Write a protein that binds this ligand. Structure first.
Ligand SMILES: Cc1nc(N)nc(-n2c(Nc3cc[nH]n3)nc3ccccc32)n1
Length: 834
């Protein structure tokens, strides 16, 4: 009966049906609100194409993949049983057209990945993947999966001229000397509309004021999505506690009556915005208030030359350049000229006096005349700007969500993480953005897979948002289908089993002793039978099904956080490879931070594809499963730069320029594969140099930088980030390029040519990276987020500068890395190792 919910609660990691932490019914209203858009999408999606989830793109095939193709021909090896045959196919051949040569379906060898539907084969991501790494395309003549397995179980305010007023009854803290006062804010966005304070009373375990705090704003002037933000400072001032309350609720009603709100502690931050109260009734500070103002909010239905240039200059500025009163007044008065420029929209809607009813009304009349916005080519950066912490207005936000509707599934996957994170900026649990994510996930198994893990990542470690996210996740699981529900169940079981082991093993050490290795092998063997399922989807690569542990190859690593090095057999017999699936299980790193950085790395890779560049980044899979815990895709055949330095020189900082180049030579079997490895490195190094510099994570110790035995360099472990260095371009990296100290080479000139083009290619997307960077810091970096933290990326991307000025600017950073040489790395050695 209700047993289905218990399953969902184990899948979610939180109990949606609990009501111990609500002062209203918004969450329950949202659950019931989402039934329709779920069922709507469940009824509309193509049952066949949903079962096989073809992963396709419409992006043009890049230059680097054309100049690799030969005579307009690619070979596809189709498999029967033991023997296989190879067929001549043109890039334009639809999977339906490949029937004639050989109803059945073409499933990729060793993966739950299908080549079906009305798209040319060049447009399938797996096909594009094989061409990049120079791999043969292997497929099987299989029977299309049954849609029955995906089957789903059947499921007036403006007539009110009164001033707003809040009765502060008092604060209550079960356990704690100075004085304390309460601050009440009417908020819209990050903007404080109206502020009133109490008097500083002695900070005891119970403090009562019983005061009426009358605001200057009127009830009619309160906009939808306005927060009463209640805060506690002590006294010399320092913030101690905060809590928020929506003044206009989910049913357009003015909030009314008695409230006792348990509050959040301290240590811009997305957590400061939440409508959730602290679930910890027993230990947290509370506050008691009264609102008493049946009141519902209604709904709605040439310039001089010198000024135009002032307007254009304002519109032209970056998203972090703040607006003065003068700028705002300009934007608002020329409302209609600003409306003609989509790029003006963030700035224009930040010039709105939201605490003024008639202005908001005019703004809404203004939104009804948005032909130019509706016709413009979708700009994600611009769209993302309207979904950040500076916009609390649903109608403003919904025109951003409108633009997201035209994104194809491939592009949704690119931005999905940060779209999920942007739910944290929504005033209300039921939003256009929450609904958009829900329907994109139910429309497609791959988006749906990742939507699950992203939401689950936050539910597991965010008291501030778990409730909202839990509701969306439940809404998702009730329409994804029995097949996936079973998939998710398997996966959840496996990782909750392996996390226990990770944490148990961590306890046993205070280096790796002889018996810890057997203790691990003992506990893994315990699981291999009862009760670990022998086949589960790899969360960061839903195309792979892992099978049995390779227990001989599993280890604990020589690091003070003692992570697990697990290896699995592939559960797919059709798998032509022999490779084990390698996953690191780790506690102690904030792998949320790794997720956000890795996702931006993917965006940079997609940016570079628009300009026919491939910089060979390895943005390894990574899933944060909980608080300072998660999994890491093992990149095979790889080792850290430091360990390469240790295995020749030893435990000293006397680093030798030659080692890396003669490490690569001994791993290359031919001279053909050596220069392939050298080239792959030149690109790799340049890819990471630029990407890390832009992000402010360039100065790293070199055992947090790795290389594969085929040249591919890649940074790892992105959690928590004398003189410095813009990035890591050490003399050993330079020796591979053929240069030494102060020279040039055919490979170094290439490296600069790649850097410059890559750097300027990101600069073409300045705004987008800026917004994703700001969002990242606010939603995933609880350590920091000051205004100055976010402003770093303006400098790094040299906003306002011409191309050549910025071209040189980077060439300088490269030159700085040569000037510094080993100094920074040597300092790091004295710092971390000693
Ligand atoms: C992506 C990747 N592939 C491989 N093979 N190995 C690692 N690796 C990581 N990964 C991460 C990622 C985030 N934190 N740590 N730590 C390591 C320590 C010593 C040797 C290898 C390590 N990472």
């Amino acid at each position: 009966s209700q047993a289905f919910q218990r399953q969902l609660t184990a899948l979610i990691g939180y109990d949606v049906t609990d009501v111990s932490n609500v002062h209203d019914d918004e969450l329950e209203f949202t659950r019931r609100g989402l039934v329709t858009p779920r069922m709507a999408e469940v009824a509309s999606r193509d049952p066949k194409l949903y079962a096989m989830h073809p992963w396709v793109t419409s992006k043009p095939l890049p230059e680097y993949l054309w100049k690799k193709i030969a005579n307009n021909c690619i070979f596809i090896v189709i498999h029967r049983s033991t023997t296989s045959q190879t067929i001549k196919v043109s890039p334009d051949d639809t999977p339906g057209a490949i029937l004639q040569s050989f109803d059945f379906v073409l499933r990729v060898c060793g993966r739950d990945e299908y080549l079906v539907g009305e798209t040319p084969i060049k447009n399938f991501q797996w096909v594009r993947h094989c061409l990049k790494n120079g791999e043969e395309i292997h497929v099987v003549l299989d029977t299309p999966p049954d849609p029955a397995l995906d089957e789903v179980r059947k499921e007036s305010l403006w007539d009110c001229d009164r001033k707003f007023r809040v009765k502060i009854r008092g604060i209550d803290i079960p356990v704690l000397d100075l004085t304390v006062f309460v601050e009440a804010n009417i908020q819209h966005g990050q903007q404080v509309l109206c502020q009133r304070r109490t008097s500083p009373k002695p900070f005891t375990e119970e403090v009562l004021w019983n005061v009426w705090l009358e605001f200057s704003i009127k009830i009619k002037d309160l906009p939808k999505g306005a927060l009463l933000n209640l805060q506690i400072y002590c006294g010399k001032v320092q913030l101690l506690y905060y809590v928020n309350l929506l003044l206009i609720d989910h049913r357009f009603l003015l909030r009314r009556g008695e409230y006792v709100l348990h509050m959040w502690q301290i240590s811009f931050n997305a957590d400061k915005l939440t409508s959730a109260t602290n679930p910890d009734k027993e230990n947290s500070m509370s506050i008691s208030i009264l609102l008493d103002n049946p009141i519902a909010l209604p709904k709605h239905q040439e310039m001089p030359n010198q000024l135009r240039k002032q307007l254009e200059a304002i519109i032209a500025t970056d998203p972090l350049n703040p607006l003065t009163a003068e700028d705002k007044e300009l934007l608002w008065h020329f409302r209609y000229e600003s409306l003609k420029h989509p790029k003006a929209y963030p700035k224009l809607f930040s010039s709105v006096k939201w605490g003024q009813q008639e202005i908001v009304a005019k703004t809404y009349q203004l939104l009804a005349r948005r032909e130019v916005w509706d016709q413009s080519a979708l700009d994600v950066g611009l769209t993302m700007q309207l979904l950040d912490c500076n916009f609390s207005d649903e109608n403003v936000r919904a025109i951003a969500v409108q633009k997201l509707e035209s994104l194809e599934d491939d592009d949704v996957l690119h931005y999905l993480l940060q779209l999920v994170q942007a739910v944290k900026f929504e005033p209300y649990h039921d939003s256009a953005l929450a609904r958009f994510l829900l329907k994109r996930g139910l429309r497609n198994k791959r988006i749906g897979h990742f939507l699950f893990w992203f939401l689950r990542s936050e539910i597991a470690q965010s008291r501030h948002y778990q409730q909202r996210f839990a509701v969306i996740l439940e809404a998702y699981l009730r329409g994804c289908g029995t097949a996936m529900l079973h998939d998710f169940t398997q996966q959840v079981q496996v990782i909750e089993m392996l996390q226990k082991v990770t944490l148990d093993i961590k306890s046993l050490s205070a280096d790796v002793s002889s018996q810890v290795i057997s203790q691990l092998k003992q506990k893994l063997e315990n699981l291999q039978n009862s009760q670990l399922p022998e086949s589960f989807r790899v969360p960061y690569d839903p195309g792979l099904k892992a099978g049995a542990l390779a227990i001989e190859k599993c280890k604990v690593m020589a690091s003070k956080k003692k992570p697990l090095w697990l290896e699995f057999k592939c559960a797919d017999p059709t798998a032509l490879s022999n490779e084990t699936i390698g996953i690191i299980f780790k506690h102690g790193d904030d792998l949320r931070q790794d997720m956000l950085i890795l996702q931006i790395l993917r965006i940079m890779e997609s940016i570079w594809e628009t300009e026919s560049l491939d910089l060979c980044l390895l943005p390894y899979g990574c899933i944060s499963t909980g608080d300072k815990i998660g999994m890491i895709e093992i990149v095979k055949d790889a080792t850290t730069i430091a360990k390469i330095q240790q295995s020749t020189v030893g435990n000293t900082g006397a680093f030798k320029d030659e080692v890396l180049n003669h490490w690569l030579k001994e791993k290359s079997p031919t001279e053909e594969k050596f220069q392939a490895a050298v080239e792959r490195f030149v690109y790799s190094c340049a890819g990471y140099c630029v990407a890390t510099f832009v992000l402010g994570i360039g100065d790293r110790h070199n055992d947090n930088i790795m290389i594969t035995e085929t040249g591919n360099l890649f940074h790892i472990d992105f959690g928590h980030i004398k003189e410095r260095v813009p990035f890591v371009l050490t003399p050993d990296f330079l020796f591979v390029m053929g240069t030494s100290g102060k020279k040039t080479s055919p490979h170094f000139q290439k490296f600069q040519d790649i850097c410059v083009k890559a750097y300027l290619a990101l600069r073409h997307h300045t705004n987008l990276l800026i917004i994703l960077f700001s969002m990242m810091l606010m939603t995933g970096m609880p350590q920091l987020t000051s205004k100055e933290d976010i402003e770093y990326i303006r400098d790094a991307l040299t906003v306002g500068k011409n191309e050549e000025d910025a071209k040189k600017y980077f060439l300088d950073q490269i030159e700085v890395c040569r000037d510094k040489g080993w100094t920074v790395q040597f300092n790091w050695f004295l710092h971390l190792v000693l």
